[PDB]
Design a protein around this ligand. Structure first.
Ligand SMILES: O=S(=O)(O)O[C@@H]1[C@@H](OS(=O)(=O)O)[C@H](O)[C@@H](CO[C@H]2O[C@H](CO)[C@@H](O)[C@H](OS(=O)(=O)O)[C@H]2OS(=O)(=O)O)O[C@@H]1O
Ligand SMILES: [Xe]
Ligand SMILES: [Xe]
Ligand SMILES: [Xe]
Ligand SMILES: [Xe]
Ligand SMILES: [Xe]
Lengths: 399, 402
């Protein structure tokens, strides 16, 4: 017959079926390759977040002495003296239980691995402490799967398969085991649940991390429209798995799909344990797993256990290529060097270093623009021009 | 007898009794200006987002320019906003006031209008007057609409006429923050009550900054939680800021033991304190040692007292570090940060952040020492980055480096 439960799949094993490729084809400071494990030299805060849903390994150096310091902001940090010659590599894994009333994440340890503490910078093994220096994430611990009776054994030993009465033939995201080493594309279910989330808004203006060509900030709310409580948001990210990127190029009607790309958490997507219900998705057009991507229209599909898929449509504007002249004199702002078309519905913000905006949400057009504010001669202002069809540009201008 | 309720007091009327001064002694802009005076009405240049937040608890007026055209766009988070064209010669000034009802399940603030004033919408950038729209350009805040007071019978009449006094069964002789009307034009220092309620807030943590908001020499970010230790829900935080009135600053100079009080200062919202309607339960308080209302203040130990209707006072202690008077030199080359001009001890436990004007940080809290510092980053030649240096014994410093 057929058994249902959860299995642990690497990023390549998960995406092979989704992209109609093979695991081998998907294996090949920044992570610009395909779906090989996401390695990173880090502190361990990302390791803490990922130990719940992902197969994580952390490397650390033996601590000889440490001291907790507080800086001028009131933030506390542990400084360690270590022996780099003595290292330990362990699995970091925890089983999320709930968000306590005090806002703390409650969890249980997992046999065979250490359970990192929130904001972890070290871990312990045989009563020795190790400062975290590297983190490696291989894939997802909990992928809902259907396993043919004859593959059950191989599933258990090779993909840590564990039958679970919560997974059935109608589970959203269910992937079927096809051979001893491959799984099918996931099957989507339209089954609705009270806790389902939908997009509140999606932004492209927040750039939380360096290294992406574009970033989408997906703000979430409950399907019935209610805003999410901290606990509801946490229950969601504690079940979040991955995101699919569908690219429609310059097709604003989302009719002609050009390509689909898989992603790897941390490198391409991230979330925090705080109170803002946001999931960030970034893309770098130069990574191998995004070969062929560029500015344009995207459809992002967030995939989480027990929740309906969350689909978000976004547009990443191309960069405006040269030729824009800005002048400031008296109350007049003059713009030249670009087509009158390029500047249609254009707008600007103007502000002098470190000061509140002198000019904000000011619609403008090619030529002279008589404003309300006076630009004090000698003062150097920053002028940010927002275009309708291009990424915004900012230049320094002296009135 | 004595009647109890709420009254509208100007900042000077409110602080006179708290500082043992008189209204007249407490009474003495354009974009870029700081409100560096005493307690006269806060009339500043602004977008209007602060205006929406203050219309609930404060007496606010907004000035706007006639809108000639507008186009919808989206902000960074994907929310709709408007870009405008206005006629600077046609302006209108109105009172902005709303009565807060509750936070909807959908996270939106529900409220009702107030006779004689417009009710701004969340994140408002304009307002309507006789079916015509005006883009907000200035805001003027006079004081607090709801101050709990005790009014002697003989004063009841002038109270209603001059301070918009309105009796209210929620206010009694035991109300925390109760101020007693002393004469036809003066109120006493507030009376503190230790009465505890389930909704009371306490300090969760306190953060300190030195270049966080334009104009502040130092600022404290007070994160809040419920008295029982529970994390606040968005609704619980909103109920608090919708009842928030002001903050008292008590200065202990260099006395880390908080034994010898050196002076007390009153504050004005928006100029000295601020909060948002988001999910983070934070209230920020700042100070500029050069403002007249803070005359004599300086680096040292402060005790901040948050004052809000129906809530126990929230007291927070914070220390603002001395200003580094030496002069530091910073340079960026390839993956190298060069630090000179300062002592060796002065750079002990120092750290830095490095980021281009409006870009994500390339360097976050990286320990540093005097001389050259190779970092996990490549600095684009010709690019001017911001380098913030946090010292152990001094306020942070930030500089522009190419
Ligand atoms: O205090 S937390 O632990 O919750 O950490 C907060 C951060 O949250 S997070 O979930 O860990 O990311 C916030 O991101 C940060 C700033 O929050 C403000 O800025 C956000 C983006 O810049 C906004 O989305 C927030 O608005 S929201 O309406 O809450 O979504 C905004 O919060 S606020 O308006 O209340 O100030 O604050 C903490 O570090
Ligand atoms: Xe690792
Ligand atoms: Xe993305
Ligand atoms: Xe105003
Ligand atoms: Xe509009
Ligand atoms: Xe402050």
């Amino acid at each position: 017959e057929t058994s249902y439960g959860y299995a642990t799949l690497s990023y390549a094993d998960y995406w092979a079926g989704e992209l109609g490729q093979s695991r081998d084809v998907l294996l090949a400071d920044l992570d610009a390759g395909m779906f090989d494990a996401v390695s990173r030299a880090t502190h361990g805060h990302g390791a803490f977040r990922q130990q719940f849903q992902y197969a994580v390994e952390v490397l650390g150096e033996k601590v000889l002495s440490k001291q907790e310091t507080e800086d001028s902001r009131g933030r506390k940090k542990w400084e360690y003296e270590t022996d780099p010659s003595v290292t330990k590599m362990v699995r970091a894994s925890a089983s999320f239980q709930d968000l306590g009333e005090d806002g703390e994440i409650k969890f249980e340890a997992v046999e065979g691995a250490v359970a990192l503490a929130d904001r972890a910078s070290s871990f312990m093994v045989d009563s020795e402490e190790y400062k975290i220096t590297n983190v490696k994430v291989h894939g997802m611990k909990f992928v809902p799967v259907a396993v043919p009776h004859e593959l059950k054994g191989i599933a258990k030993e090779k993909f840590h398969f564990v039958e679970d009465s919560r997974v059935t033939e109608n589970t959203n995201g269910l992937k079927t085991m096809l051979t001893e080493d491959s799984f099918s594309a996931r099957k989507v279910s339209s089954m609705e649940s009270p806790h389902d989330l939908v997009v509140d808004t999606v932004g492209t203006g927040y750039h939380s991390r360096f290294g992406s060509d574009a970033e989408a900030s997906v703000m979430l709310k409950r399907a019935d429209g209610s805003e999410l409580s901290h606990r509801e948001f946490i229950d969601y990210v504690m079940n979040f798995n991955t995101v699919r990127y569908d690219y429609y190029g310059d097709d604003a009607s989302y009719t002609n799909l050009m390509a689909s790309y898989g992603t790897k958490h941390s490198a391409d997507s991230w979330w925090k344990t705080g109170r803002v219900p946001r999931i960030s998705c970034g893309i770098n057009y130069g990574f191998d797993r995004f070969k062929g991507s560029g500015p344009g229209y995207y459809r992002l599909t967030l995939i989480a256990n027990g929740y309906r898929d969350v689909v978000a449509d976004v547009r990443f504007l191309p960069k405006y290529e040269g030729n824009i002249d800005i002048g400031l004199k008296g109350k007049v702002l003059t713009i030249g060097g670009a087509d009158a078309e390029t500047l249609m519905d254009a707008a600007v913000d103007v502000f002098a270093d470190g000061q509140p905006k002198l000019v904000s949400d000011q619609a403008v057009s090619l030529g002279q623009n008589v404003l309300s504010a006076d630009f004090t001669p000698g003062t150097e202002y920053t002028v940010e021009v927002r275009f309708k069809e291009f990424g915004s540009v900012r230049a320094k201008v002296v009135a």
